[PDB]
Protein backbone atom coordinates (compact mmCIF):
# COMPACT_ATOMS: atom_id res chain seq x y z
CA UNK A 1 0.00 0.00 0.00
CA UNK A 2 2.84 2.39 0.83
CA UNK A 3 4.52 1.65 -2.51
CA UNK A 4 1.33 1.99 -4.56
CA UNK A 5 0.05 5.12 -2.77
CA UNK A 6 2.14 8.22 -2.11
CA UNK A 7 1.97 11.91 -2.99
CA UNK A 8 3.87 15.12 -2.34
CA UNK A 9 2.48 18.50 -1.30
CA UNK A 10 0.90 20.35 -4.25
CA UNK A 11 4.08 22.37 -4.86
CA UNK A 12 7.07 21.80 -2.57
CA UNK A 13 10.77 22.63 -2.77
CA UNK A 14 13.12 20.19 -1.06
CA UNK A 15 15.64 22.79 0.13
CA UNK A 16 13.07 24.86 2.03
CA UNK A 17 11.16 21.81 3.27
CA UNK A 18 14.28 20.22 4.74
CA UNK A 19 15.65 23.52 6.09
CA UNK A 20 12.38 23.71 8.04
CA UNK A 21 12.02 20.06 9.08
CA UNK A 22 15.61 19.26 10.12
CA UNK A 23 16.38 22.47 12.06
CA UNK A 24 14.53 21.54 15.31
CA UNK A 25 16.47 18.30 15.81
CA UNK A 26 19.88 19.98 15.40
CA UNK A 27 19.65 21.93 18.65
CA UNK A 28 19.86 19.17 21.28
CA UNK A 29 22.83 17.73 23.19
CA UNK A 30 22.10 13.98 23.43
CA UNK A 31 24.62 13.12 20.70
CA UNK A 32 27.34 15.10 22.49
CA UNK A 33 26.28 13.59 25.83
CA UNK A 34 26.65 9.95 24.73
CA UNK A 35 30.37 10.36 23.99
CA UNK A 36 31.15 11.03 27.66
CA UNK A 37 29.26 7.85 28.55
CA UNK A 38 31.39 6.01 25.99
CA UNK A 39 34.56 7.43 27.57
CA UNK A 40 33.47 6.32 31.04
CA UNK A 41 32.65 2.82 29.80
CA UNK A 42 36.01 2.43 28.06
CA UNK A 43 37.76 3.75 31.18
CA UNK A 44 35.90 1.43 33.55
CA UNK A 45 36.56 -1.71 31.50
CA UNK A 46 40.32 -1.13 31.57
CA UNK A 47 40.25 -0.18 35.26
CA UNK A 48 38.45 -3.44 36.02
CA UNK A 49 40.96 -5.41 33.95
Amino acid sequence: VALLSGKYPPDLVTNVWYADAIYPMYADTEVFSNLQRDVITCEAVQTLV
Binding site: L3, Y8, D11, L12, V13, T14, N15, V31, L35
Partner: protein
Protein backbone atom coordinates in the same frame (compact mmCIF):
# COMPACT_ATOMS: atom_id res chain seq x y z
CA UNK B 1 17.20 -21.11 -9.10
CA UNK B 2 20.99 -20.74 -9.18
CA UNK B 3 21.40 -22.15 -12.71
CA UNK B 4 18.54 -20.83 -14.82
CA UNK B 5 19.19 -23.35 -17.61
CA UNK B 6 17.81 -26.18 -15.44
CA UNK B 7 14.32 -24.69 -15.83
CA UNK B 8 12.90 -25.94 -19.12
CA UNK B 9 11.91 -23.02 -21.40
CA UNK B 10 9.16 -25.09 -23.06
CA UNK B 11 7.57 -26.76 -20.01
CA UNK B 12 7.92 -23.93 -17.45
CA UNK B 13 7.97 -20.76 -19.59
CA UNK B 14 6.31 -18.40 -17.12
CA UNK B 15 8.40 -19.61 -14.19
CA UNK B 16 11.52 -19.35 -16.36
CA UNK B 17 10.58 -15.74 -17.14
CA UNK B 18 10.07 -15.10 -13.42
CA UNK B 19 13.52 -16.47 -12.59
CA UNK B 20 15.07 -14.37 -15.37
CA UNK B 21 13.31 -11.26 -14.03
CA UNK B 22 14.59 -12.00 -10.52
CA UNK B 23 18.15 -12.33 -11.81
CA UNK B 24 18.10 -9.25 -14.06
CA UNK B 25 15.92 -6.58 -12.43
CA UNK B 26 16.50 -7.10 -8.70
CA UNK B 27 17.64 -4.05 -6.68
CA UNK B 28 21.38 -3.46 -6.22
CA UNK B 29 23.18 -1.69 -3.34
CA UNK B 30 24.75 1.77 -2.99
CA UNK B 31 26.26 4.07 -0.35
CA UNK B 32 25.60 7.55 1.01
CA UNK B 33 28.61 8.61 3.16
CA UNK B 34 26.87 9.89 6.29
CA UNK B 35 28.13 11.97 9.17
CA UNK B 36 31.47 13.56 10.08
CA UNK B 37 34.42 11.60 11.53
CA UNK B 38 36.34 14.63 12.84
CA UNK B 39 34.51 15.53 16.06
CA UNK B 40 32.42 12.38 16.38
CA UNK B 41 34.20 9.06 16.07
CA UNK B 42 33.72 6.28 13.53
CA UNK B 43 31.56 3.82 15.48
CA UNK B 44 30.84 1.63 12.44
CA UNK B 45 32.40 -1.82 12.13
CA UNK B 46 32.93 -4.27 9.24
CA UNK B 47 32.62 -1.27 6.87
CA UNK B 48 34.82 1.70 6.01
CA UNK B 49 34.15 4.75 8.18
CA UNK B 50 31.59 7.36 7.10
CA UNK B 51 29.27 5.30 4.90
CA UNK B 52 25.90 3.52 4.81
CA UNK B 53 24.83 0.59 2.67
CA UNK B 54 21.40 0.41 1.09
CA UNK B 55 19.32 -2.47 -0.30
CA UNK B 56 18.41 -0.27 -3.30
CA UNK B 57 20.29 2.07 -5.60
CA UNK B 58 20.66 5.81 -5.00
CA UNK B 59 20.65 8.65 -7.53
CA UNK B 60 20.82 12.15 -5.98
CA UNK B 61 18.09 14.53 -7.09
CA UNK B 62 19.36 17.16 -9.51
CA UNK B 63 16.42 19.57 -9.12
CA UNK B 64 14.53 20.82 -6.07
CA UNK B 65 11.08 20.92 -7.69
CA UNK B 66 10.32 17.19 -7.93
CA UNK B 67 7.89 16.04 -10.61
CA UNK B 68 6.74 12.56 -11.56
CA UNK B 69 8.91 10.26 -13.64
CA UNK B 70 8.86 6.53 -14.36
CA UNK B 71 12.61 6.20 -15.08
CA UNK B 72 12.92 4.33 -11.81
CA UNK B 73 14.25 0.96 -10.69
CA UNK B 74 11.39 0.23 -8.28
CA UNK B 75 9.00 1.26 -11.07
CA UNK B 76 10.68 -1.08 -13.56
CA UNK B 77 10.26 -3.84 -10.98
CA UNK B 78 6.51 -3.23 -10.77
CA UNK B 79 6.22 -2.99 -14.56
CA UNK B 80 8.03 -6.31 -15.01
CA UNK B 81 5.74 -7.96 -12.45
CA UNK B 82 2.73 -6.61 -14.36
CA UNK B 83 4.08 -7.90 -17.69
CA UNK B 84 4.72 -11.31 -16.13
CA UNK B 85 1.13 -11.43 -14.90
CA UNK B 86 -0.13 -10.40 -18.34
CA UNK B 87 1.90 -13.23 -19.89
CA UNK B 88 0.38 -15.55 -17.28
CA UNK B 89 -3.17 -14.50 -18.11
CA UNK B 90 -2.73 -14.82 -21.90
CA UNK B 91 -1.52 -18.41 -22.24
CA UNK B 92 -3.00 -21.22 -24.32
CA UNK B 93 -2.95 -23.53 -21.28
CA UNK B 94 -4.58 -20.84 -19.09
CA UNK B 95 -6.51 -18.43 -21.36
CA UNK B 96 -9.51 -20.72 -22.16
CA UNK B 97 -10.23 -21.21 -18.45
CA UNK B 98 -11.61 -17.67 -18.15
Amino acid sequence: FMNIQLISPIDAPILRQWAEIIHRYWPNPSQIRYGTPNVFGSANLFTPPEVLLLPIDHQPANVTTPTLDFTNELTNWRARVCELMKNLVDNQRYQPGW
